[PDB]
Amino acid sequence: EKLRLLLNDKDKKSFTDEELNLFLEEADCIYCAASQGWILKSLQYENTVGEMYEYKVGQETYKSSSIKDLVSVAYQNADKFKDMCTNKKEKGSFMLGISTEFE
């Protein structure tokens, strides 16, 4: 199923069901939809990791990769999916005949 394959190509339950259908409608090739969804997922990091990515309380210390690294990883996923779609639709070079009518 295209929806299930797309939810395999991305994290399974971060997105609601209807926007997966929206992305499937927007692009017929599933990998283009995966790239779009990955960029949209990458937008999320401003909420969680943007406002706080490294905190220490008492002796408790926690560090997480900055927003730049995570969005870079998500963008890399998006670009890989886009290149995958291009290679899917790509076709090699061609030499063809040519002919014009004459009397």
Binding site: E51, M52, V57, Q59, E60
Partner: protein
């Protein structure tokens, strides 16, 4: 620093690892040169964390025996006003021995309260 930044940070930090706590407050009231104690019970959401690498003291005597350690801190939001004095106490029932709030650090921004950094004593 803006008040909203501090509020968001405190609420987030509490919500990473919150525990529902039943604070019990015994406030001593001076009556005829002696104390009349009124017991109230208040609930808050709280995160507990280590702050000091201390050692468990023991105080056995003819009155009885109890061992307490000073390691654990505490971090609570603005939802309830707290206060600890000589005449006022705050305790709660953590599963691993009863906790007791020793000292309160009120986090204030521009004369406005936003949350209490707090310290505990785990009375065994």
């Amino acid at each position: 620093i803006n008040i909203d930044r501090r509020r968001k940070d405190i609420i987030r930090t509490i919500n990473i690892n919150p525990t529902n706590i039943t604070i019990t407050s015994i406030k001593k009231t001076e009556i005829d040169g002696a104390f009349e104690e009124t017991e109230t019970e208040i609930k808050c959401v709280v995160r507990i964390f280590n702050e000091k690498t201390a050692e468990k003291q023991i105080s056995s005597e003819k009155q009885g025996t109890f061992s307490s350690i000073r390691t654990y801190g505490m971090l609570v939001s603005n939802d309830v006003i707290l206060e600890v004095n000589s005449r006022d106490s705050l305790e709660f029932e953590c599963i691993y021995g009863r906790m007791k709030i020793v000292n309160i650090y009120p986090q204030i921004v521009k004369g406005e309260l936003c949350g209490y950094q707090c310290s505990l004593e785990r009375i065994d």
